[PDB]
Amino acid sequence: TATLRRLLGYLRPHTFTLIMVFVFVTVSSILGVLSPYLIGKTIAVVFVPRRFDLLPRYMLILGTIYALTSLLFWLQGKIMLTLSQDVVFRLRKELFEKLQRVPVGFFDRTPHGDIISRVINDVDNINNVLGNSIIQFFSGIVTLAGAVIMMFRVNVILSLVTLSIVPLTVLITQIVSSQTRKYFYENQRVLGQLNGIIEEDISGLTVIKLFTREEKEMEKFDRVNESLRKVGTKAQIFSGVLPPLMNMVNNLGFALISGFGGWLALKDIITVGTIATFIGYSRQFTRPLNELSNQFNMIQMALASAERIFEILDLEEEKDDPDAVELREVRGEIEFKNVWFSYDKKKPVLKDITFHIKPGQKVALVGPTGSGKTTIVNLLMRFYDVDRGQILVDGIDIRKIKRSSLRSSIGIVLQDTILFSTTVKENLKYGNPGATDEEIKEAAKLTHSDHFIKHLPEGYETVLTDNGEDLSQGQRQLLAITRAFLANPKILILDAATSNVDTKTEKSIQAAMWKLMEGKTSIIIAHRLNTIKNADLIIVLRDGEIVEMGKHDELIQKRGFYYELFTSQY
Amino acid sequence: KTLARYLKPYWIFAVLAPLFMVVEVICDLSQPTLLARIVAEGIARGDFSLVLKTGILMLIVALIGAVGGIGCTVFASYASQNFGADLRRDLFRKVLSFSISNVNRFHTSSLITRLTNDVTQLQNLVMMLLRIVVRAPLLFVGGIVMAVSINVKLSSVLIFLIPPIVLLFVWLTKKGNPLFRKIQESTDEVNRVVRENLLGVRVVRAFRREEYENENFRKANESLRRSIISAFSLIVFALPLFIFIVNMGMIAVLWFGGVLVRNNQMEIGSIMAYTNYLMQIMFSLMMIGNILNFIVRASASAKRVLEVLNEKPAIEEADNALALPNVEGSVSFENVEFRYFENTDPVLSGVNFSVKPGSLVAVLGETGSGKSTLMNLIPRLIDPERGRVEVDELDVRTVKLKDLRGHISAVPQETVLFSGTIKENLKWGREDATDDEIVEAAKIAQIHDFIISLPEGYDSRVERGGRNFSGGQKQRLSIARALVKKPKVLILDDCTSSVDPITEKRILDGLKRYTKGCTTFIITQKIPTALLADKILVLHEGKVAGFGTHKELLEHCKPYREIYESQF
Amino acid sequence: QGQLVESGGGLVQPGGSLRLSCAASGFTLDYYAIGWFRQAPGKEREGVSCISNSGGSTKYADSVKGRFTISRDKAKNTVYLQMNSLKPEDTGVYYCAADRGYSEYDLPCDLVIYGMDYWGKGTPVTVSA
Ligand SMILES: Nc1ncnc2c1ncn2[C@@H]1O[C@H](COP(=O)(O)OP(=O)(O)OP(O)(O)=S)[C@@H](O)[C@H]1O
Ligand SMILES: Nc1ncnc2c1ncn2[C@@H]1O[C@H](COP(=O)(O)OP(=O)(O)OP(O)(O)=S)[C@@H](O)[C@H]1O
Ligand SMILES: [Mg+2]
Ligand SMILES: [Mg+2]
């Protein structure tokens, strides 16, 4: 019921069209089964004149009816084809829209292929219910109502005998349908987990071939595929087990009216002909009722598919407070007041984190491998909301300013250099879409990026592969820095941006990058200590604790953790 | 012929299906046969002895159709699922053999849809074909005989409606190939935008281009729905027109039958029995017409499945291949010249250097020169256009892949940490490795201290990609991952990048202490770390710059001098 | 459902002290962070003291120093806040905090909360002559 009223509730703005769908199909329903009756009416009149006389008069009506039925059947499909694809488009858009509001944590823990299956497979699974299936539903009930009226006008008592076995046929259907929903739901989630393994291997197939884990990855696929095969057989049987099983239920009715009506014909209650004609009208009653029951199993099949879609359409979103305020005149006043945060919630990452940064200051942060330097960055990004503490940007709190207006003047380059499938020009256009070629070209030359862009076979309009694998790790990092500077942010963060890039190229950018850094609040995180000594305020973090704070020369003379890192270089 | 081999192992389910189906057809056709004798020979005759004689008998004949019906559904579902399961693993086996150059030809998002949607579409086609494999020709070949038996001359009008019908299905077949192809390409387009948003969601939110990504998916979704309706419009047009041709024949029966019976007075009932039998024909043509729409839908899908096996991968096992279990560690390069693609510039040109067996060799050069590309040629990951690579006195290509890769382990620049557990991730090199062996490898990488601090330890939850642990944490894991297998030829591409200088010394010096007389390759951008290596090889613009000790490289080499001057 | 219950105090002339308990239903004081808040009607929403974990955490306010005595129950799950010598300075609807704690850290003091604003229901105890 939960997804039944939910999925079928998407047809609500198109209710006015659905009434017309019902009207156009009813005409095709009252003329479709009337075809052998239409021929018999003509012959009954032209039984005496044999040929001609009134025969050419009846042929003119017969031809116009079949021409009308063919014109309306195409008309029924055309109006429904657009209506069906609109619901399919709606659920697919709704799935995508929710993902952008849903927190980062979800993406890091759920499989990437699982969402892919939810977008394509799960939406292509509900594509069958939206189409001819809805048309046959309206066609079924009218043929059922059209048969029950013909039934009672011929036989009254015997029509009740055929209707008495109807709730028993529904009773068994309710058991089969529930079992079909029980199996198709499991079929999809297993496929969802299996689809994730496909994306997992494609993104990093080099690692699999090198360690000879190709056999282990094959049996990893086989272990889920065998569970998919075993549950898939049982799901496909239940999907089509109701139609042949209903034949035995129908055959009971054929034997029932032959006995119950046979008892009347013997005692001379109702003539043998009253039962001999009733068998033909009982066939036009059973056929649509079983068709509706078979198409009740298929809706339950789609109900299981729709159930997997609403699982994400019910998942929490990053919401802005109703008293939201847009940040006017951004300068970059970073403020921290005793911040304590836990990433995994099992082990605390950060303990007592506090610092005040003036607008347009150069700030450096360095320490050991796996301390909590990158964690502070994403807290400022508001990817993971503060557990205990206070963070204020430009005098106003992080929670008070809306997520879009807060991130408006924030720029970041990640450890995992991420590149889109789009062109180099469009990738660099991120942040500032209204940036001319003059701004794109000049920025590349300043940070040693243009050197390899012109070297490409296409140039600036070159297509980028999976995570931009067409260029080396160092070249990829340089493009991200250009992308970050092009957006023109007041607050700038460069997380390991100069790790893959060589020390020789780094010196050529060192001064040019610092010349663009002026008038902007900057926070840089990198292990290369001989490139972060230009920073005004330097903070040292170890095991998620602030041990040292102050100028570069002050850290050297004090002889601590900063001194231990600097000396260990050579 | 190629697709037919997948039906061959499950032929038992395919040979038993048309045998039991014939019994189902005759049982359903016997419905008014026993319904006549229960009334005319039972009720009309008077005696109750003949009433129950056909009374209980009608349930018995119905049971044959009921058991036979449900039984057929089991064998059809079992065969279709096995056809899909065996196809997936055979396609997945060819997926693993593809190179980075194969991603450019066949899209990164297209393969995902090909392994599921393209398989699922062809899976239902086998189910549709098996249901009418003996059902459809029995009522068509054995059905036309019934039409001629009632009236031979009246069965002549059916031939006149054949030309527009035979010209209609072929029209759907020819148009079914390009129209349905664009649907299968648009499914990969909607797969692309969702994957682009998923992989790197942090970058999307950082520049507020979520609205830009909202437009990209909407435009791809609009392109998908328009591609579907264009091919499905042909279906909702051919179907009512298919009935319209046989509808003309229905009017033709009265037009022909009227001229037929004028003096005969016997063939009156023959026109009556023909018109009533036409109701079974009218509904059957709609069923066959529905199956034809699934064939043209699966035709575009079958083309995508077949172009997986036909597409020859860049790297495969040699014809004159020999198994090399023992590897000493001899690495050589003769006139090596490589180009990634056809339109690409010379990546590597004029490479001539020999590596000492069991020596730590460092590789240096600027961004975009040819360090990572050169290292891939050792465990066979790219085939050169000119020149040969030599490993253990002989060529690399002429040696079996299972022996070569099974003894030579490499660590990439971009560290990949697969989903599962720490114990499962470290067992990537050696799956048969004991608990003591995997623990000791982590001690060299110094990552062991973080594993014990976790509440679950080695069995802690590890996620796909590597965003479950910090940049340097997964980086330290990848070095130890290769150390479990203990290779004779070890390749390290940017071993220390997200590692602090104190820990950098403990890892670099820690490897030299445990590995004696082992061929090691390390790519470092720092001069003090490069000095520990026995010989340093320099690369610039693909061409070789210098080979030998640091002291000799300061005078003899020019780009290496520029690295030293820039650092200090 | 995760909700808090706040009760205590009537109408006392400035000078006395009132017992105010923050009873938690479906939430234990053994781990979660629950703290009282000095909230005025139509004005700003200040805090009292945010105490968490079974081990205990010492905390007080800055406006009225060392006068808001706190105590925690291990079995009853209640936080008693006895305002030692009341002043008409702090009058209005007081609130408690739900989730955003898990263990023990510092709490200085205001919490996030996505639901409405703060969970516990405002009890008005005006201490004016
Ligand atoms: N998948 C690829 N497709 C096309 N060209 C590529 C690909 N990978 C690398 N290249 C090119 O190969 C050349 C050298 O690449 P690499 O060996 O990866 O660089 P590198 O010496 O490691 O540089 P770093 O890592 O940035 S110091 C460059 O001209 C790249 O553009
Ligand atoms: N997704 C995550 N799940 C659990 N813990 C995480 C996650 N991301 C980061 N952490 C933890 O955060 C702590 C510090 O890591 P980060 O701040 O991300 O990186 P870092 O301090 O720059 O260290 P590097 O990258 O290794 S030099 C570690 O204890 C990690 O286990
Ligand atoms: Mg980090
Ligand atoms: Mg490299």
Contact B442, B506 (CB under 8 A): no
Burial of A434 from C-beta contacts in 10 A (0-12 / 13-18 / 19+)? exposed
Q: Which amino acid is at A410?
A: I
Q: Which of residues 125-184 of A touch B (CB under 8 A)?
A: none
| Residue C46 at interface with chain A, using a CB cutoff of 8 Å | no
The total number of structural domains that make up chain B: 2
Q: Are B461 and B549 within one domain? A: yes
Fold of A320-570: Rossmann fold (3.40.50)
Find where tokens 């909407």 sit. B218
Touching status, chains C and A (3+ beta-carbon pairs under 8 Å): yes
Task: Enumerate neighbours of B (3 or more CB pairs within 8 A).
Answer: A
Q: Give the closest residue to A142 by CA, choosing from A27, A260, A229.
A: A27
Report the Cα B95 to chain-centroid distance in Å: 6
Q: Are B32 and B78 within one domain? A: yes
Q: Are B322 and B293 within one domain? A: no
- Residues after which a C–N gap over 2.5 Å breaks chain B: none
Of A338, A352, A399, the CB nearest to C112: A399
Q: Are B412 and B329 within one domain? A: yes
CATH code: domain of residue B350: 3.40.50.300
Residue B252 in tokens: 């033709």
Any atom of ligand 2 within 6 Å of the Cβ of B497: no
Residue B545 in tokens: 């710059």
Pocket residue to mutate for ligand 1, from B98, B101, B340, most atoms within 8 A of Cβ = B340
Chain B residues whose CB is inside 8 A of the A474 CB are 367-368
Omega prior to C109 cis, within 30 of 0: yes
Contact B195, A199 (CB under 8 A): yes
Selected for mutation to probe chain C from A388, A391, A399 (highest C CB count within 10 Å) is: A388
Count H helices and E strands in chain B, helices first: 22, 10
For chain B, the C-alpha Rg in angstroms (whole number) is 36
How many whole angstroms separate alpha carbon B77 and alpha carbon B13? 10
DSSP string, B248-272: HHHHHHHHHHHHH-SS--STHHHHH
Resolution (A): 4.2
What angle, rounded to 10 degrees, do the helices at B210-260 and B162-198 form? Answer: 170
- Residues 6 or more apart whose Cβ sits within 8 Å of residue B492: B410, B411, B479, B520, B521, B522, B523
Find where tokens 């057929």 sit. B72
Taking residue A47's Cβ as centre, other Cβ atoms within 10 Å add up to: 9
How many whole angstroms separate alpha carbon B299 and alpha carbon A140? 32
Count H helices and E strands in chain C, helices first: 0, 8
Taking residue A554's Cβ as centre, other Cβ atoms within 10 Å add up to: 12
Q: Are B284 and B340 within one domain? A: no
> What is the greatest pairwise CA distance in chain B?
123
Selected for mutation to probe chain B from A57, A81, A139, A211 (highest B CB count within 10 Å) is: A211
How many whole angstroms separate alpha carbon B312 and alpha carbon B307? 10
- Residues 6 or more apart whose Cβ sits within 8 Å of residue A515: none
Contact A158, A276 (CB under 8 A): no
Instruction: For B495, list phi and psi in degrees, rounded to 5.
Output: -55, -40
Closest chain A C-alpha to B287 CA, distance in angstroms: 13
Q: Which amino acid is at C115?
A: G
Quick one: which atom of ligand 1 is closest to the CA of B366? Answer: 27
The gap between the terminal CA atoms of chain A, to the nearest Å, is 70
- Residues 6 or more apart whose Cβ sits within 8 Å of residue B321: B398, B399, B400
Task: Give the annotated binding-site residues of A for ATP.
Answer: 367-374
Chain A residues whose CB is inside 8 A of the C35 CB are none
What angle, rounded to 10 degrees, do the helices at A503-517 and A437-446 form? Answer: 130
| Residue A359 at interface with chain C, using a CB cutoff of 8 Å | no
Task: Give the annotated binding-site residues of A.
Answer: 367-374
SS3 A167: helix
Contact A310, A6 (CB under 8 A): yes
Determined by which method? X-ray
Chain C residues whose CB is inside 8 A of the A348 CB are 103, 105
Q: How many residues belong to chain B? A: 568
> What is the greatest pairwise CA distance in chain A?
125
How many whole angstroms separate alpha carbon B182 and alpha carbon B188? 10
Contact C112 A386 (CB under 8 A): yes
SS3 C33: strand
Contact A171, A291 (CB under 8 A): no
Write down which residue in B279, B314, B349 finishes a domain.
B314
Q: Which amino acid is at C50?
A: C
Q: Is B271 left (phi over 0), alpha (psi -120 to 50) or beta?
A: alpha
| Residue C83 at interface with chain A, using a CB cutoff of 8 Å | no
CA–centroid distance, B466 to ligand 1, in Å, is 23
Burial of B510 from C-beta contacts in 10 A (0-12 / 13-18 / 19+)? middle
- Residues 6 or more apart whose Cβ sits within 8 Å of residue A50: B258, B261, B262
Burial A9-23 (b: 16+ CB within 10 A, else e): ebbeebeeebeebbe
Find where tokens 């529904």 sit. A170
How many whole angstroms separate alpha carbon A553 and alpha carbon A313? 55
Contact A239, B19 (CB under 8 A): no
How many whole angstroms separate alpha carbon B252 and alpha carbon B246? 10
Chain C residues whose CB is inside 8 A of the A385 CB are 112
| Residue A335 at interface with chain C, using a CB cutoff of 8 Å | no
For chain C, the C-alpha Rg in angstroms (whole number) is 14
Quick one: which atom of ligand 1 is closest to the CA of B494? Answer: 25
Residue A512 in tokens: 């040019």
- Residues 6 or more apart whose Cβ sits within 8 Å of residue B226: none
- B98-102: Cβ within 8 A, 24+ apart: B98/A205, B98/B311, B98/B313, B99/B313, B99/B314, B99/B315, B99/B381, B99/B382, B100/A206, B100/A465, B100/A469, B101/B314, B101/B340, B101/B341, B102/B311, B102/B313, B102/B314
CA–centroid distance, A369 to ligand 3, in Å, is 8
Report the DSSP beta bridge partners of residue B230: none
What angle, rounded to 10 degrees, do the helices at A55-101 and A35-45 form? Answer: 170
Contact B81 A232 (CB under 8 A): yes
Find where tokens 């965003």 sit. B467
Chain A residues whose CB is inside 8 A of the C32 CB are none
SS3 A151: helix
Distances (CA, A) of A196 to A560, B115, B386, C41: 47, 11, 39, 53
Find where tokens 């992989």 sit. B199
* Parallel/antiparallel/unpaired status of strands B360-364 and B519-523: parallel
Find where tokens 């299981």 sit. A304
CA angle A20, A25, A26 (to 5 degrees): 100
CA–centroid distance, A374 to ligand 3, in Å, is 4
| Residue C103 at interface with chain A, using a CB cutoff of 8 Å | yes
Find where tokens 């319904």 sit. B35
Q: How many residues belong to chain A? A: 570
HEC string of A493-541 equals EEECCCCCCCHHHHHHHHHHHHHHHCCCEEEEECCCHHHCCCCCEEEEE
Chain A residues whose CB is inside 8 A of the C101 CB are 387-388
DSSP assignment letter at B43:
I
- Residues after which a C–N gap over 2.5 Å breaks chain C: none
Ligand nearest to the CA of A527: 2
Residue A395 in tokens: 């005098």
Any atom of ligand 1 within 6 Å of the Cβ of A474: yes
Strands of the sheet containing A521-525, edge to edge, are A410-413, A491-495, A521-525, A362-366, A537-541, A546-550
Q: Which domain holds residue B34?
A: 1-314
How many whole angstroms separate alpha carbon A558 and alpha carbon B303? 71
Helix ranges, B329-414 (H): 372-375, 401-404
Q: Are B292 and B347 within one domain? A: no
For chain A, the C-alpha Rg in angstroms (whole number) is 36
Closest chain A C-alpha to C87 CA, distance in angstroms: 29
Contact A241, B452 (CB under 8 A): no
Q: Is the dihedral of CA A396, A397, A402, A406 positive or negative?
A: positive
Write down which residue in B314, B349, B371 finishes a domain.
B314
- Residues 6 or more apart whose Cβ sits within 8 Å of residue B88: A221, A225, B115, B119
How many whole angstroms separate alpha carbon B469 and alpha carbon B473? 6
Nearest CA to ligand 1 atom 26: A474
The answer to whether B369 is annotated as binding is yes
Q: Are B536 and B420 within one domain? A: yes
* Parallel/antiparallel/unpaired status of strands A334-341 and A350-353: antiparallel
Selected for mutation to probe chain A from C105, C106, C109, C110 (highest A CB count within 10 Å) is: C105
Q: Give the closest residue to B482 by CA, choosing from B517, B548, B418, B430.
A: B430
Q: Are B417 and B529 within one domain? A: yes
HEC string of B85-150 equals HHHHHHHHHHHCCCCCCHHHHCCCCHHHHHHCHHHHHHHHHHHHHHHCCCHHHHHHHHHHHHHHHH
* Parallel/antiparallel/unpaired status of strands A388-393 and A491-495: unpaired
Distances (CA, A) of A532 to A511, A526, B257, B388, C107: 12, 8, 101, 44, 33
HEC string of B448-513 equals HHHHHHCCCHHHCCECCECCCCCHHHHHHHHHHHHHHHCCCEEEECCCCCCCCHHHHHHHHHHHHH
| Residue C110 at interface with chain A, using a CB cutoff of 8 Å | yes
Residues of chain A with CATH 3.40.50.300: 320-570
Any atom of ligand 1 within 6 Å of the Cβ of B223: no
Q: Give the closest residue to A80 by CA, choosing from B206, B95, B327, B229.
A: B229
Report the DSSP beta bridge partners of residue A335: A356, A392
Residue C106 in tokens: 């510092």
Burial of B548 from C-beta contacts in 10 A (0-12 / 13-18 / 19+)? middle
Any atom of ligand 1 within 6 Å of the Cβ of B367: yes
CA–centroid distance, B564 to ligand 4, in Å, is 20
Report the DSSP beta bridge partners of residue B348: B338
Q: Which of residues 377-396 of A touch C (CB under 8 A)?
A: 385-390
Selected for mutation to probe chain A from B475, B495, B500, B529 (highest A CB count within 10 Å) is: B500
* Parallel/antiparallel/unpaired status of strands B331-338 and A521-525: unpaired
How many whole angstroms separate alpha carbon B316 and alpha carbon B329? 23
* Parallel/antiparallel/unpaired status of strands A388-393 and A396-397: antiparallel
CA–centroid distance, B413 to ligand 1, in Å, is 11
Any atom of ligand 1 within 6 Å of the Cβ of A466: no
Domains of chain C plus CATH, in order, are 1-117 (2.60.40.10)
Touching status, chains B and C (3+ beta-carbon pairs under 8 Å): no
Residue B208 in tokens: 């507020």
Any atom of ligand 1 within 6 Å of the Cβ of B276: no
The gap between the terminal CA atoms of chain C, to the nearest Å, is 40
Contact B366 A67 (CB under 8 A): no
How many whole angstroms separate alpha carbon A245 and alpha carbon B72? 12
SS3 of chain A: helix, strand, coil, percent, to 5:
60, 10, 30
Q: Give the closest residue to B182 by CA, choosing from B227, B118, B225, B216.
A: B227
The answer to whether B359 is annotated as binding is no
Residue A284 in tokens: 């036009």
Find where tokens 């299906």 sit. B17
Ligand nearest to the CA of B450: 2
How many whole angstroms separate alpha carbon A453 and alpha carbon A471? 10
Q: Which amino acid is at B286?
A: M
Closest chain A C-alpha to C53 CA, distance in angstroms: 14
Report the DSSP beta bridge partners of residue B520: B360, B490
SS3 C67: coil
Contact C70, C79 (CB under 8 A): yes
Q: Are B194 and B326 within one domain? A: no
Q: Is A365 left (phi over 0), alpha (psi -120 to 50) or beta?
A: beta
DSSP assignment letter at B560:
H
Chain A residues whose CB is inside 8 A of the C57 CB are none
Q: Is A131 left (phi over 0), alpha (psi -120 to 50) or beta?
A: left
Count H helices and E strands in chain A, helices first: 25, 10
Chain B residues whose CB is inside 8 A of the A36 CB are 275-276, 278-279
